[PDB]
Design a protein around this ligand. Structure first.
Ligand code: HEM
Ligand code: NAG
Ligand code: NAG
Ligand code: NAG
Ligand code: NAG
Ligand code: NAG
Ligand code: 1NP
Ligand code: 1NP
Ligand code: CL
Ligand code: MG
Length: 324
C-alpha cells in the first residue's frame, strides 16, 4: 500500500549519521530528478537507484517533507510508465536489468530516463532528449540558472527566478529543438518542478524560499545535501506554482518538426482542466504501453492505477481502462 503522511512532519536534520552522502559505485543509477538522486545518495533510497514505489514515497516524505498526495501521484505515475509492474521496481535513471523480466512491447520499462513518458523537455539543468542527454547534470544550463538567480533573485533561486527561467527554457527549446513537446503531463510537471528547489532544497529552519547557489549546486550536480541540512518544516510540493505560471502564461503545444513552429494543441489538458490530465495519462499514456495485458499485468496495472488515483487532487472521477 502507498505509505501515509508523516506522523511527525517537523523540520529536522536529515543529513544525519544514518544517512551520509556517499559517492556512486559502479552500477549505481542516477537520473533526471535531483530529489530522488539525493535521496539515493544519502541512503534514504537504495544507493543503486532502483526502488519500490513505497520506498520512494517514504524517502521523499522522510528526507524532504514532500507531501503525501504529491508523492503518491508522482511515484505511481512514474512507476506505471517507467517501472516494472510485476517486480514492483523502478529505476530512478537509465533502463536496467535490475528491474527484472520485461513486459511485452510496447511497454519500455525504461526508468525515469525514458523520454516522453514522465521525463520531458525544457528541464532547468538537464538538456532535452533531442540534444543527446536528458538526465545528466549540465553545467552550462546550471550556470544559466545561476545567472537568472543573480538577475531576478538577488543571487538566490526563488519563485521569481523560477518564473523567468521556466519561460527562458521553453523559448530556447522552441528555437532549437524541432521535436519540442510541451503538452499534457509534461506541461504540468514542467511548472511544478521549478518550485521544488525553493520549497524543498531550502533549509527548513529558514523555509524562506531563497535557495543559495552552493546548496543548489550540491543538490543538482552532486545529489548531496548541505552539511547540517534540515528538511522543510511541513509537508509541501508545488506551492507557489501560480507565481511561475503568472510570470509568462503559456498554452500547451509542440514544435511540428521544425524550430520556431510552436503549435498549440487544443486536445491537451492545461491548468484549467486538471482532471483531463489525469484521464489522458491513464486512457492514452498508460493504456498505449499496455494495450492488452495478460492476467498478472492487468492485475498489477489496476492496483497501481488505484494507488495513482489516491494522489489525484479532489473532485476528479476515477477512470478504468481495464474495467473494474
Ligand atoms: C515523488 C517522487 C518523484 C519522482 C518520481 C520524481 C521524478 C522526476 C522526474 C522524472 C523529473 C524529470 C522532469 C524533467 O524532465 O525535467 C523530475 C524533475 C525534478 N524533480 Fe522530481 N520526482 C519526484 C519528487 C521530487 C522531489 C521530492 C524533489 C525535491 C525534493 C524533486 C525535485 C525535482 C527537480 C528539481 C526537478 C527538475 C530538475 C531540472 O529540471 O533540472 N522531485 N522529477
Ligand atoms: C516531532 O519531531 C520533532 C523534531 O524531531 C520533536 O521536537 C518533537 O518532539 C516530535 N513530536 C512532535 C509531536 O512534534
Ligand atoms: C520527439 O517527440 C516524440 C513525440 O512527439 C517522442 O515520441 C520522441 O521520443 C521525441 N524524440 C526526441 C529524441 O526528442
Ligand atoms: C549542456 O547544455 C548546453 C547548452 O544547451 C549544450 O550546448 C551542451 O551540448 C550540453 N551538454 C554538455 C556536456 O554541455
Ligand atoms: C526573489 O528575490 C528577489 C530579490 O531579492 C525579490 O525581489 C523577489 O521578491 C523574490 N521573489 C520571491 C518569490 O521570493
Ligand atoms: C477515458 O476512458 C473512460 C472510460 O474508461 C471514459 O469514460 C473517459 O471519458 C475517457 N477520458 C478521456 C479523456 O479520454
Ligand atoms: O508537477 C509535479 C507535481 C507533483 C510531483 C512531481 C514530481 C516530479 C515532477 C513534477 C511534479
Ligand atoms: O498545481 C500544480 C501544478 C503543476 C505541478 C505541480 C506539482 C506538484 C504540486 C502541484 C502542482
Ligand atoms: Cl503529507
Ligand atoms: Mg527533461
Amino acid at each position: 500500500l502507498p505509505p501515509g503522511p508523516l506522523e511527525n512532519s517537523s523540520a529536522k536534520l536529515v543529513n544525519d549519521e544514518a544517512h551520509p552522502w556517499k559517492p556512486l559505485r559502479p552500477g549505481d543509477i542516477r537520473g533526471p530528478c535531483p530529489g530522488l538522486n539525493t535521496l539515493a545518495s544519502h541512503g534514504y533510497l537504495p544507493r543503486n537507484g532502483v526502488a519500490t514505489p513505497a520506498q520512494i514515497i517514504n524517502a521523499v516524505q522522510e528526507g524532504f517533507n514532500f507531501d503525501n498526495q504529491a508523492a503518491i501521484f508522482a511515484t505511481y505515475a512514474a512507476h506505471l510508465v517507467d517501472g516494472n509492474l510485476i517486480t514492483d521496481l523502478l529505476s530512478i535513471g537509465r533502463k536496467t536489468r535490475l528491474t527484472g523480466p520485461d513486459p511485452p512491447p510496447p511497454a519500455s520499462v525504461g526508468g525515469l530516463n525514458e523520454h516522453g513518458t514522465f521525463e520531458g523537455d525544457a528541464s532547468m539543468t538537464r538538456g532535452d532528449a533531442f540534444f543527446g542527454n536528458n538526465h545528466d547534470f549540465n553545467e552550462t544550463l546550471f550556470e544559466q540558472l545561476v545567472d537568472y538567480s543573480n538577475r531576478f533573485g538577488g543571487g538566490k533561486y526563488n519563485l521569481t527566478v523560477a518564473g523567468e527561467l521556466r519561460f527562458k527554457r521553453i523559448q530556447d527549446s522552441i528555437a532549437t529543438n524541432p521535436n519540442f513537446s510541451f503538452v499534457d503531463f509534461r506541461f504540468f510537471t514542467a511548472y511544478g518542478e521549478t518550485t521544488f528547489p525553493a520549497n524543498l532544497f531550502v533549509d527548513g529552519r529558514r523555509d524562506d524560499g531563497q535557495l543559495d547557489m552552493d546548496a543548489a549546486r550540491s543538490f543538482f550536480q552532486f545529489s548531496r545535501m548541505p552539511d547540517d541540512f534540515f528538511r522543510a518544516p511541513s509537508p509541501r510540493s508545488g506551492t507557489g506554482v501560480e507565481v511561475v505560471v503568472q510570470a509568462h502564461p503559456m498554452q500547451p503545444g509542440r514544435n511540428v518538426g521544425k524550430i520556431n513552429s510552436y503549435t498549440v494543441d487544443p486536445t491537451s489538458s492545461d491548468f484549467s482542466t486538471p482532471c483531463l490530465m489525469y484521464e489522458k495519462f491513464v486512457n492514452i499514456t498508460v493504456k498505449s504501453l499496455y494495450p492488452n495485458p495478460t492476467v498478472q499485468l492487468r492485475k498489477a496495472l489496476n492496483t497501481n492505477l488505484d494507488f495513482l488515483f489516491q494522489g489525484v487532487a479532489a473532485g476528479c472521477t476515477q477512470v478504468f481502462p481495464y474495467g473494474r
